[PDB]
């Protein structure tokens, strides 16, 4: 059965080529027995032993002899060596999708549309439907679950509860190609995701396809919760610094939210805390960056595990005193004070993780993503064609570096310099004018 003769559709057949090879060797053996019993002359039985030798050594390894090729097609046939000399072992409980963004869920719950979630958890649903008391057997369960009554979505939402799945992208490169999640059922046809984690897959959103598997047993579920869920890999295995740096839009929002203009509306007054700073921004009275003295209260744990307090009057903007309402008690005020680009926002997460632990870093990450999106929305930073100002010095500088090259050309035409030195003068002149 390893070398079958399975019938195709409608009379024609299909076979592996070992049938023709074994038929050749059996034929030539039988013929040599017939010729050796009748006592023929010697040249005939010598040719017989030689061509039987060729047949056996073409059956054991075809490719180091005359390459015995089949009739009716000029492709060379294969034998046992090329069934060991040789990508994938295909898997049940699979699926694939297109991905979208969905920035309203936390960093450990990807979505799942309903239909893949019903075509993947069908044995769990069959078992719990026949165990609850809404059915007689699995035949009645199969009759119930496919015409889609309205009392199977609750059983699906009770077996989804904390059962992990395993997202995965196709050209897997490094160790964070296989993370693990906990699904939230949702309408639609595309797998949702998170806008932070897509800095680690090297995955754009222009139509790249991910894959969902399912772990089945009990040791597998507990292992995929303890060792590889998506909130115990926030330290890249190459270096120290975390791989959850914000990527595209939220860094622009948190760059616009901590700056300092020279004169904005309502600049000069003195507030009484971060809550009244937020309430003076939302009342449409003072704008979002104007230098204004506020007070703060840091919290320090430089003692033997004890949180000591402090208070002062510091000199900041309204934007940083709005951003201060998110940082937990551990960090000092030397973090939210600067211009807050990208290196600073990697360093803020790094020092929070190296001081407090894991769960303040998780909650700090999700809160910083939500504030980044809300103020990138209410800023409205866009580009028009009247923002790329070409200088007022293009014509004169191009005129100077066009006159000097023509001077060097007429110096070469009179035979005072040579070709290589002229060619190394012109490159020098142009590559200075560029800078």
């Amino acid at each position: 059965d390893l070398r079958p003769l399975v019938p195709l559709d409608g009379g024609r057949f299909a076979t592996s080529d070992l049938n023709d090879l074994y038929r050749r060797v059996i034929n030539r053996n039988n013929r040599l027995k017939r010729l050796l019993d009748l006592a023929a002359p010697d040249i005939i039985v010598r040719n017989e032993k030689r061509m039987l030798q060729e047949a056996v050594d073409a059956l054991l390894d075809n490719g180091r002899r005359g390459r015995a090729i089949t009739g009716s097609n000029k492709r060379p046939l294969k034998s046992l060596a090329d069934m060991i000399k040789g990508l994938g072992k295909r898997v049940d409980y699979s699926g694939r999708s297109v991905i979208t963004v969905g920035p309203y869920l936390r960093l450990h719950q990807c979505g799942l549309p309903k239909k893949m979630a019903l075509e993947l958890f069908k044995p769990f649903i069959y078992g719990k439907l026949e165990l609850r008391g809404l059915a007689t057997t699995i035949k009645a369960a199969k009759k119930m679950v496919e015409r889609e009554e309205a009392v199977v979505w609750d059983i699906l939402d009770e077996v989804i509860r904390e059962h992990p799945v395993l997202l995965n992208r196709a050209p897997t490169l490094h160790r964070l190609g296989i993370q693990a999640f906990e699904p939230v059922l949702i309408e639609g046809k595309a797998i949702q995701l998170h806008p932070l984690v897509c800095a680690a897959y090297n995955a754009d959103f222009d139509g790249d396809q991910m894959a969902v598997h399912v772990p089945l047993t009990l040791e597998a579920q507990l292992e995929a919760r303890a060792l590889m869920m998506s909130t115990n890999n926030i330290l890249s295995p190459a270096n120290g610094e975390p791989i959850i740096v914000p990527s595209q839009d939220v860094v622009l929002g948190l760059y616009y939210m901590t700056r300092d203009c020279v004169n904005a509306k309502g600049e000069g007054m003195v507030l009484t805390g971060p809550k009244e700073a937020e309430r003076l921004y939302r009342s449409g009275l003072a704008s979002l960056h104007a230098r204004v003295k506020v007070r703060i209260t840091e919290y320090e744990k430089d003692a033997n595990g004890e949180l000591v307090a402090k208070t002062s009057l510091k000199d900041t903007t309204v934007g940083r005193a709005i951003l201060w309402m998110i940082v937990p008690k551990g960090l000092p005020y030397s973090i939210v004070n600067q211009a807050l680009g990208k290196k600073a926002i990697s360093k803020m997460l790094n020092t929070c993780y190296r001081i407090l632990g894991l769960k303040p870093t998780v909650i700090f990450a999700d809160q910083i993503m939500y504030t980044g999106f809300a103020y990138a929305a209410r800023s409205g930073a866009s580009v028009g064609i009247d923002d790329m100002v070409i200088p007022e010095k293009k014509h004169e500088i191009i005129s100077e570096a066009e006159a000097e090259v023509a001077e060097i050309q007429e110096q070469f035409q009179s035979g005072l310099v040579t070709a290589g030195e002229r060619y190394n003068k012109v490159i020098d002149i142009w590559a200075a004018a560029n800078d």
């Binding site: 040719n47 030689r50 061509m51 060729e54 005359g66």
Partner: peptide, 10 residues
Amino acid sequence: DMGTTDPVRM
């Protein structure tokens, strides 16, 4: 692999 046998002729 570095760093007159055909049965119709004979």
